Amino acid sequence: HPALWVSKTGLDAQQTNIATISNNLANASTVGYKKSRAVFEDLFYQNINQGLMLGAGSKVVATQKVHTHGNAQTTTNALDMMVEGDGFFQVTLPDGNIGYTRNGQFTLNGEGTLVTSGSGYPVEPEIVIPEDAISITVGTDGEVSVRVRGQQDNQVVGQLTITDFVNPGGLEPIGQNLYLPTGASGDPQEGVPGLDGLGEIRQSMLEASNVNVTEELVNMIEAQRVYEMNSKVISSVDKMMSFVNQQL
Amino acid sequence: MHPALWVSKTGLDAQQTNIATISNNLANASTVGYKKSRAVFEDLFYQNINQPGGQSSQNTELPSGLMLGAGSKVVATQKVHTHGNAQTTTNALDMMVEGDGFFQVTLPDGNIGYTRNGQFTLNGEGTLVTSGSGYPVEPEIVIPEDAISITVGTDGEVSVRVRGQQDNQVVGQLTITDFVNPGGLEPIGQNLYLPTGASGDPQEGVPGLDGLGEIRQSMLEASNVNVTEELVNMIEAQRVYEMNSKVISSVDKMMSFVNQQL
Amino acid sequence: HPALWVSKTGLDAQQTNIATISNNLANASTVGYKKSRAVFEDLFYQNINQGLMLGAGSKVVATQKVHTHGNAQTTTNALDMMVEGDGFFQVTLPDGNIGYTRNGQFTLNGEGTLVTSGSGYPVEPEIVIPEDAISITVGTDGEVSVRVRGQQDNQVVGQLTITDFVNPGGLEPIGQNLYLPTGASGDPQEGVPGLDGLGEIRQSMLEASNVNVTEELVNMIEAQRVYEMNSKVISSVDKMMSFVNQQL
Amino acid sequence: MHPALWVSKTGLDAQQTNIATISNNLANASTVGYKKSRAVFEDLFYQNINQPGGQSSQNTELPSGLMLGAGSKVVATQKVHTHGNAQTTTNALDMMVEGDGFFQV
Amino acid sequence: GLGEIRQSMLEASNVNVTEELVNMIEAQRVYEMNSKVISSVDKMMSFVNQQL
Amino acid sequence: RNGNLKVDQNGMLTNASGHLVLGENDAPITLPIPLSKIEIGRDGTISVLPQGAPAEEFQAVDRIKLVKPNDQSLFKDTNGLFRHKTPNQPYEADATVSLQTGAIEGSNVNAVGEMTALIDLQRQFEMQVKMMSTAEEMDKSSDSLLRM
């Protein structure tokens, strides 16, 4: 019976949709997180009793990352920074290839290299903080400098660079607030952080999650009811088929 | 076979198609820009049994003029292209047509498909493509890599904000297509429709003049399915399905009685 | 079974009513927004045993706009103005025709033309503010004059006019706080505001929405119960028909 | 699923933007030379089920039609560039523009 | 003896929703009861032409 | 009585079954091709809005031909269309019939009435079949007259 499996597509589509909604609400406190919306599209149509068109159901075809900039969180840490605009921080993965992140919670390793606060991947290009530094300053263009006692003027230890993608929604998330460039993402466009469409580095600031907690709660309401509605079609079809073979 | 058995079977087949039509309507209750379909029923051809010819008006109220129907069938699955509600989104690339009009996308085989869904995005080259299979949107619109924001006017004017230059740069303009009979478009899935003879030749134009709809940025059109219509339709279709089954069961026992008694 | 659809009309009619209630509640902060009420009417009655009358249900036949003057909001902005009385502002649509608005939140574009604070459509008649002006004054009869340093007396830059209709409820809403004239709206009666039944222009003041939030919440209560009341009949008819074919 | 669900959803989004606008006004209550902002509400399109003024029967037309709204949204954030008060200081390098104009950096 | 015209007031319907639901219950059960008689007559006659 | 109307690409107004709908001229109703708003009047009047025209350019184009003849003088044809029993009798257009637009009329089959007549047909059918069996039983018995 086609109605059994047409409604099963609706149940599968809602189950995928609810999973993405729960992912958004789970990452409501993750720094630099971009929410996602499931994209619904109807399946193919069959021309039966040939000019009569019957649908095959629906499915979730893709999950679209909405890369809208989140709010600003002011912190007293001197190593967590935020990109004010378009751009990603680039880090070095253990595989050797570069991953791209929007979470700016950084720190230092034992040797002074600027690394991520989680797994500890180094940040490209390498920035090394000397042991004699008493303060670390990151300029609006990625110019990292440190203060040394007995020496007027901050010495420059390096300059950070950020990467922008034409289609950030095409990036492949691999967890840990990291992305991998893909075919549809585009060509990684590096450069000085603050020129040619790139964002500006904001030291001692963090980018909040852009999820809308109220929207996801309403989306749960509409996803739950449609899920229940398709269950009744399956139940009614079961009663119809149980009636036919019992009656006949 | 016994004609009474096949008359009820046609009603069983007709209601099954109606049930499947309802099931797809409820399945696509969240699909953006989905138009609900309804099933239309009609009575089959009426045959004169007691007349050697076809003189139906002769004695139609007498036994010689008795005419028996051949059952029922679903003549068509009609599309109802009513305007759906509005979903205000924060994405800058999903858009809605308010009123008459269709977005035009380029199919892989070469022709152009038409859709009411406006969930768009960019590919690696900056071309405005759909967020599903990624088909380019007609006319081709390319977003420069230096743009910091994207603005879509009510007439399809797509503008970008580039740092350095004052005033926004125009990168192109969108167009939408209207059809004389929207119900004549054949659905091919992927939220896409194809023009047919029953629909008419596409009438392209600027989105907002000549009666076309206006483009609304950061908005989406929800499906117009009525979740209560389908449930009420399910109730009637289930009952009609069971009533015709009893006729089939009744005819079976009557035929069983004849060859068991005689 | 006719009882299924008579109740089903009540369900669709109540759904239409609830949609109008939510629209009023959604636009509880919209400036110059007029609340709406759905109008119910019974469908045709039939003679069945020819002196027996049976109705066909009910439907929402119209949604009436309540054009009652709302309260006044005192703002310090000098470009948001309110029509005190009867009349509408006139804006220039991109199509070239004139749309009528009661939302008076206006502003200037890059050249000095008085345009709406939203889409930016120019206001008819055209008013252009010279760049040397230091303050903008709008008279109670639409007289617009500016203050120029080095010259005694405010110079007049133009005059505002408002359009009145015999039946404001016949105006077709097109969104964006805009209306369009129809055959039942009446004849556009232009004129100097404050004269011959027209309202007065009040600068630095705004008209609040005339929605009664308490009424909408009560209207939801009676619409929800009647909606649930009709669903019980459909359930009862479904059980009755399920009993007949299970018994007969 | 239900028209009221979508209509009210637009209202929730409208108020969240409006509340976010007010929060920035109070956050920048001590910022020198800050201009407050006001959110501009506007209704969405209307579903034209029955055209108001359309001809009903003959020599009769609907005075009002069946048109259903779609909700509301915040379309603009209007800055009120009115002149603020004056703070007198002892520093000789903090200046104020007395009227219209902007410092350029 | 005619009534008066009251402006800005509307006459609500005089339906009693609870009364209709109570009448719905009684009409539903009576509907089922008559179907029981029809089934009983059919089963009685079915016994005749089968047994006899 | 199938009021499920539709408009094709040429503008002809047909119903769900493909039958052309007649008008005042007694010819099938044809509308202008680029429509933007079609409203059916209470008395069958068809008022359209040309594409791009303002809301005040509402004009009627045709009128649905509604006929109210004597019901007992009609017979259902082989294709479900009711016609006059007397051939070559014109269908006079009635000015009293009203159309409730925005709705579709279903069938008037009384499902319970059909079922309670089905159970009667079964019993009467089976009783006559028993008469057939008792007819051959009598013949077999009377066949012993000639046996000797």
XYZ file of N, CA and C in Angstrom, chain B residues 76-238:
489
model
N -8.842 13.271 -11.708
C -7.632 14.074 -11.652
C -7.237 14.324 -10.205
N -5.965 14.659 -10.012
C -5.430 15.116 -8.731
C -5.119 16.602 -8.893
N -6.101 17.438 -8.569
C -6.007 18.861 -8.856
C -5.127 19.576 -7.839
N -4.263 20.458 -8.337
C -3.424 21.297 -7.495
C -4.185 22.558 -7.106
N -4.069 22.952 -5.844
C -4.689 24.167 -5.334
C -3.559 25.135 -5.008
N -3.303 26.075 -5.914
C -2.188 27.009 -5.773
C -2.586 28.258 -4.993
N -3.145 28.064 -3.804
C -3.443 29.189 -2.933
C -2.162 29.728 -2.307
N -2.207 30.991 -1.898
C -1.038 31.621 -1.300
C -0.876 31.163 0.144
N 0.305 30.643 0.470
C 0.585 30.184 1.812
C 0.947 31.321 2.747
N 1.233 30.953 3.992
C 1.601 31.935 4.999
C 3.052 32.373 4.810
N 3.518 33.235 5.706
C 4.846 33.825 5.618
C 5.714 33.329 6.765
N 6.944 32.942 6.446
C 7.938 32.557 7.439
C 9.073 33.569 7.398
N 9.156 34.406 8.425
C 10.193 35.425 8.510
C 11.469 34.790 9.049
N 12.496 34.727 8.211
C 13.764 34.107 8.557
C 14.864 35.157 8.625
N 15.950 34.801 9.308
C 17.112 35.671 9.415
C 18.157 35.404 8.340
N 17.936 34.414 7.481
C 18.854 34.153 6.382
C 18.662 35.195 5.289
N 19.768 35.633 4.697
C 19.741 36.703 3.708
C 19.600 36.200 2.278
N 19.458 34.890 2.073
C 19.396 34.328 0.733
C 18.127 33.543 0.436
N 17.225 33.382 1.398
C 15.936 32.752 1.147
C 14.874 33.827 0.947
N 14.058 33.655 -0.087
C 13.175 34.712 -0.552
C 11.824 34.128 -0.933
N 10.814 34.993 -0.954
C 9.448 34.597 -1.254
C 8.873 35.494 -2.338
N 8.023 34.909 -3.176
C 7.208 35.652 -4.127
C 5.838 35.853 -3.497
N 5.425 37.108 -3.345
C 4.122 37.436 -2.780
C 3.128 37.653 -3.914
N 2.312 36.645 -4.181
C 1.367 36.696 -5.271
C 1.734 35.759 -6.403
N 1.355 36.171 -7.608
C 1.601 35.356 -8.788
C 3.061 35.452 -9.216
N 3.631 34.321 -9.582
C 4.999 34.263 -10.057
C 5.689 33.003 -9.581
N 6.743 32.629 -10.304
C 7.539 31.457 -9.976
C 9.014 31.774 -10.171
N 9.849 31.280 -9.259
C 11.289 31.314 -9.479
C 11.655 30.360 -10.607
N 12.668 30.724 -11.385
C 13.110 29.924 -12.519
C 14.523 29.417 -12.268
N 14.702 28.100 -12.354
C 15.990 27.463 -12.118
C 16.362 26.645 -13.346
N 17.663 26.413 -13.505
C 18.200 25.701 -14.659
C 18.366 24.226 -14.314
N 17.610 23.369 -14.999
C 17.733 21.931 -14.818
C 19.011 21.421 -15.483
N 19.558 20.297 -15.006
C 20.786 19.767 -15.620
C 20.647 19.444 -17.097
N 19.479 18.978 -17.538
C 19.306 18.583 -18.930
C 19.188 19.769 -19.880
N 19.020 20.984 -19.363
C 19.037 22.161 -20.210
C 17.847 23.087 -20.060
N 16.660 22.529 -19.842
C 15.460 23.344 -19.744
C 15.400 24.045 -18.387
N 14.346 24.830 -18.185
C 14.186 25.661 -17.000
C 13.013 25.134 -16.187
N 13.243 24.913 -14.894
C 12.194 24.514 -13.984
C 11.718 25.680 -13.138
N 10.473 25.589 -12.684
C 9.814 26.677 -11.977
C 9.389 26.210 -10.594
N 9.656 27.038 -9.586
C 9.419 26.667 -8.201
C 8.899 27.864 -7.420
N 8.117 27.572 -6.381
C 7.720 28.574 -5.403
C 8.625 28.592 -4.180
N 9.385 27.524 -3.952
C 10.334 27.493 -2.850
C 11.477 28.463 -3.117
N 11.871 29.198 -2.082
C 12.880 30.221 -2.244
C 14.128 30.011 -1.417
N 14.323 28.802 -0.891
C 15.524 28.519 -0.117
C 16.726 28.428 -1.046
N 17.420 29.545 -1.231
C 18.551 29.643 -2.140
C 19.849 29.750 -1.355
N 20.955 29.664 -2.086
C 22.288 29.789 -1.515
C 23.261 30.079 -2.653
N 24.554 29.992 -2.360
C 25.604 30.186 -3.345
C 26.411 28.904 -3.477
N 27.051 28.729 -4.628
C 28.015 27.656 -4.798
C 29.423 28.244 -4.712
N 30.428 27.433 -5.045
C 31.805 27.875 -4.897
C 32.164 29.063 -5.766
N 31.397 29.300 -6.826
C 31.658 30.397 -7.748
C 30.852 31.649 -7.431
N 30.056 31.637 -6.364
C 29.255 32.788 -6.006
C 27.950 32.925 -6.757
N 27.564 31.923 -7.542
C 26.312 31.981 -8.282
C 25.150 31.566 -7.388
N 24.062 32.331 -7.455
C 22.878 32.060 -6.646
C 22.219 30.769 -7.119
N 22.307 29.719 -6.303
C 21.736 28.420 -6.624
C 20.813 27.993 -5.486
N 19.979 26.997 -5.771
C 19.057 26.477 -4.775
C 19.816 25.715 -3.691
N 19.202 25.629 -2.514
C 19.822 24.981 -1.365
C 19.558 23.484 -1.312
N 18.974 22.913 -2.359
C 18.721 21.492 -2.468
C 19.763 20.848 -3.356
N 19.408 20.568 -4.609
C 20.344 19.969 -5.549
C 21.383 20.955 -6.069
N 21.167 22.255 -5.889
C 22.136 23.245 -6.307
C 21.983 23.753 -7.719
N 20.780 23.711 -8.275
C 20.573 24.182 -9.638
C 20.710 25.699 -9.690
N 21.373 26.250 -10.706
C 21.471 27.710 -10.815
C 20.104 28.349 -11.013
N 19.968 29.571 -10.508
C 18.729 30.334 -10.593
C 18.828 31.287 -11.774
N 17.782 31.319 -12.602
C 17.718 32.196 -13.766
C 17.065 33.528 -13.400
N 17.637 34.663 -13.828
C 18.896 34.823 -14.574
C 20.104 34.607 -13.676
N 21.269 34.299 -14.241
C 22.454 34.055 -13.429
C 22.819 35.295 -12.624
N 23.035 35.102 -11.326
C 23.418 36.172 -10.414
C 24.676 35.735 -9.683
N 25.737 36.529 -9.798
C 27.031 36.218 -9.203
C 27.316 37.240 -8.114
N 27.662 36.755 -6.929
C 27.973 37.601 -5.780
C 29.486 37.773 -5.717
N 30.005 38.999 -5.732
C 31.454 39.187 -5.616
C 31.967 38.748 -4.255
N 33.229 38.314 -4.234
C 33.840 37.849 -2.996
C 34.058 38.973 -1.992
N 34.063 40.227 -2.440
C 34.281 41.364 -1.559
C 33.007 41.838 -0.871
N 31.846 41.331 -1.273
C 30.589 41.777 -0.689
C 30.499 41.384 0.780
N 30.013 42.311 1.602
C 29.810 42.046 3.019
C 28.341 41.835 3.370
N 27.410 42.238 2.509
C 25.995 41.978 2.721
C 25.304 41.921 1.368
N 24.157 41.248 1.337
C 23.383 41.053 0.118
C 21.988 41.620 0.337
N 21.552 42.481 -0.578
C 20.231 43.088 -0.528
C 19.474 42.760 -1.806
N 18.234 42.308 -1.654
C 17.361 41.988 -2.777
C 16.171 42.932 -2.725
N 15.998 43.723 -3.780
C 14.894 44.653 -3.836
C 13.577 43.970 -4.137
N 12.507 44.766 -4.087
C 11.179 44.237 -4.362
C 10.936 44.001 -5.844
N 11.823 44.479 -6.717
C 11.719 44.250 -8.153
C 12.804 43.310 -8.665
N 13.399 42.512 -7.783
C 14.463 41.609 -8.157
C 15.849 42.213 -8.151
N 15.973 43.509 -7.876
C 17.279 44.154 -7.827
C 18.119 43.567 -6.703
N 19.237 42.944 -7.064
C 20.146 42.339 -6.098
C 21.371 43.234 -5.974
N 21.602 43.757 -4.774
C 22.689 44.687 -4.514
C 23.626 44.114 -3.461
N 24.883 44.551 -3.511
C 25.904 44.113 -2.571
C 26.555 45.337 -1.946
N 27.074 45.157 -0.736
C 27.764 46.207 0.001
C 29.247 45.870 0.041
N 30.058 46.684 -0.628
C 31.500 46.480 -0.705
C 32.182 47.551 0.129
N 33.146 47.136 0.946
C 33.851 48.073 1.805
C 34.744 48.987 0.976
N 34.839 50.246 1.341
C 35.596 51.165 0.481
C 34.684 52.064 -0.322
N 33.880 51.514 -1.232
C 32.996 52.289 -2.125
C 31.734 52.664 -1.378
N 31.234 53.898 -1.522
C 29.934 54.313 -0.931
C 28.863 53.924 -1.934
N 27.623 53.746 -1.542
C 26.515 53.216 -2.337
C 26.709 51.735 -2.647
N 25.607 51.004 -2.779
C 25.672 49.576 -3.051
C 25.818 49.314 -4.543
N 26.518 48.233 -4.873
C 26.709 47.816 -6.253
C 25.606 46.857 -6.677
N 25.087 47.064 -7.880
C 24.072 46.186 -8.448
C 24.763 45.076 -9.226
N 24.446 43.829 -8.882
C 25.070 42.668 -9.510
C 24.150 41.957 -10.488
N 22.908 42.389 -10.622
C 21.971 41.752 -11.520
C 20.550 42.040 -11.078
N 19.618 41.287 -11.657
C 18.208 41.428 -11.326
C 17.500 40.096 -11.516
N 16.606 39.772 -10.584
C 15.826 38.549 -10.662
C 14.585 38.749 -11.526
N 14.075 37.637 -12.050
C 12.826 37.614 -12.794
C 11.981 36.446 -12.312
N 10.665 36.593 -12.434
C 9.730 35.529 -12.096
C 8.780 35.328 -13.266
N 8.212 34.130 -13.347
C 7.354 33.732 -14.453
C 5.962 33.404 -13.930
N 4.940 33.869 -14.644
C 3.554 33.560 -14.336
C 2.965 32.700 -15.446
N 1.980 31.881 -15.086
C 1.318 30.994 -16.029
C -0.182 31.249 -16.001
N -0.819 31.055 -17.158
C -2.257 31.284 -17.267
C -3.024 30.307 -16.386
N -2.625 29.036 -16.402
C -3.240 27.987 -15.589
C -2.153 27.359 -14.727
N -1.945 27.858 -13.506
C -0.910 27.269 -12.642
C -1.136 25.798 -12.347
N -2.392 25.347 -12.313
C -2.675 23.947 -12.057
C -2.204 23.009 -13.149
N -1.880 23.541 -14.329
C -1.411 22.721 -15.429
C 0.056 22.365 -15.386
N 0.800 22.903 -14.426
C 2.210 22.562 -14.293
C 2.355 21.140 -13.765
N 3.189 20.343 -14.430
C 3.385 18.995 -13.906
C 4.457 19.006 -12.822
N 4.171 18.480 -11.632
C 5.202 18.410 -10.589
C 6.198 17.302 -10.904
N 7.484 17.619 -10.790
C 8.548 16.661 -11.050
C 9.383 16.408 -9.796
N 8.844 16.727 -8.625
C 9.600 16.622 -7.396
C 10.591 17.759 -7.254
N 11.385 17.680 -6.183
C 12.400 18.687 -5.869
C 11.794 20.081 -5.734
N 10.510 20.146 -5.374
C 9.761 21.400 -5.289
C 9.726 22.130 -6.628
N 9.870 21.391 -7.725
C 9.978 21.972 -9.054
C 8.774 21.589 -9.902
N 8.402 22.490 -10.809
C 7.308 22.271 -11.741
C 7.812 22.470 -13.161
N 7.156 21.803 -14.109
C 7.484 21.960 -15.514
C 6.266 22.434 -16.296
N 6.436 23.397 -17.199
C 5.301 23.853 -18.006
C 4.826 22.767 -18.957
N 3.519 22.745 -19.195
C 2.892 21.792 -20.098
C 1.910 22.534 -20.996
N 1.286 21.791 -21.911
C 0.267 22.387 -22.756
C -0.925 22.885 -21.961
N -1.306 22.147 -20.916
C -2.423 22.554 -20.073
C -2.120 23.810 -19.267
N -0.844 24.118 -19.038
C -0.463 25.299 -18.270
C -0.363 26.537 -19.156
N 0.492 26.486 -20.168
C 0.684 27.592 -21.083
C 2.142 27.990 -21.188
N 2.401 28.867 -22.151
C 3.755 29.350 -22.365
C 4.174 30.259 -21.212
N 5.425 30.167 -20.762
C 5.881 31.028 -19.664
C 5.809 32.501 -20.036
N 5.440 33.324 -19.059
C 5.342 34.773 -19.223
C 6.310 35.419 -18.237
N 7.556 35.592 -18.667
C 8.583 36.182 -17.822
C 8.391 37.690 -17.713
N 8.783 38.238 -16.569
C 8.686 39.671 -16.353
C 9.348 40.064 -15.053
N 9.506 41.370 -14.885
C 10.107 41.909 -13.660
C 9.181 41.627 -12.482
N 9.701 41.157 -11.350
C 8.830 40.769 -10.232
C 8.233 41.947 -9.480
N 7.085 42.439 -9.938
C 6.419 43.535 -9.264
C 5.631 44.444 -10.181
N 5.891 44.362 -11.480
C 5.097 45.054 -12.484
C 4.324 44.038 -13.317
N 3.328 44.543 -14.048
C 2.470 43.721 -14.904
C 1.747 42.635 -14.112
N 1.410 42.925 -12.858
C 0.651 42.006 -12.039
C 1.448 40.898 -11.388
N 2.761 40.855 -11.589
C 3.572 39.818 -10.972
C 3.737 40.082 -9.478
N 4.129 39.035 -8.758
C 4.389 39.166 -7.342
C 5.706 39.858 -7.052
N 5.832 40.328 -5.816
C 7.028 41.018 -5.363
C 7.931 40.063 -4.593
N 9.234 40.291 -4.703
C 10.227 39.464 -4.029
C 10.448 40.019 -2.628
N 10.281 39.166 -1.624
C 10.518 39.519 -0.231
C 11.747 38.765 0.252
N 12.763 39.502 0.688
C 13.991 38.881 1.154
C 13.840 38.423 2.598
N 14.600 37.385 2.953
C 14.592 36.817 4.302
C 13.192 36.366 4.711
N 12.448 35.809 3.757
C 11.120 35.274 4.011
C 10.932 33.994 3.213
N 10.033 33.139 3.694
C 9.730 31.879 3.031
C 8.232 31.620 3.098
N 7.732 30.889 2.105
C 6.309 30.598 1.981
C 6.057 29.175 2.464
N 5.303 29.045 3.551
C 4.984 27.732 4.085
C 3.992 27.009 3.179
N 3.902 25.696 3.367
C 2.930 24.906 2.626
C 1.517 25.311 3.019
N 0.612 25.288 2.043
C -0.771 25.686 2.258
C -1.670 24.510 2.613
N -1.092 23.360 2.962
C -1.901 22.207 3.329
C -2.655 22.502 4.618
N -3.901 22.046 4.681
C -4.734 22.184 5.870
C -4.714 20.850 6.606
N -4.037 20.815 7.757
C -3.896 19.573 8.509
C -5.221 19.045 9.032
N -6.267 19.868 9.040
C -7.599 19.421 9.422
C -8.418 18.934 8.236
N -8.191 19.492 7.044
C -8.851 18.973 5.849
C -8.465 17.524 5.593
N -7.177 17.203 5.736
C -6.717 15.848 5.455
C -7.323 14.847 6.430
N -7.404 15.211 7.712
C -7.966 14.300 8.704
C -9.449 14.053 8.455
N -10.194 15.094 8.080
C -11.599 14.909 7.731
C -11.725 14.122 6.432
N -10.826 14.371 5.477
C -10.826 13.595 4.241
C -10.487 12.134 4.507
N -9.579 11.876 5.452
C -9.253 10.499 5.810
C -10.464 9.775 6.381
N -11.265 10.471 7.190
C -12.407 9.837 7.840
C -13.420 9.366 6.804
N -13.761 10.233 5.849
C -14.730 9.847 4.828
C -14.175 8.758 3.920
N -12.911 8.887 3.511
C -12.326 7.915 2.593
C -12.221 6.538 3.235
N -11.923 6.488 4.535
C -11.853 5.205 5.227
C -13.222 4.540 5.301
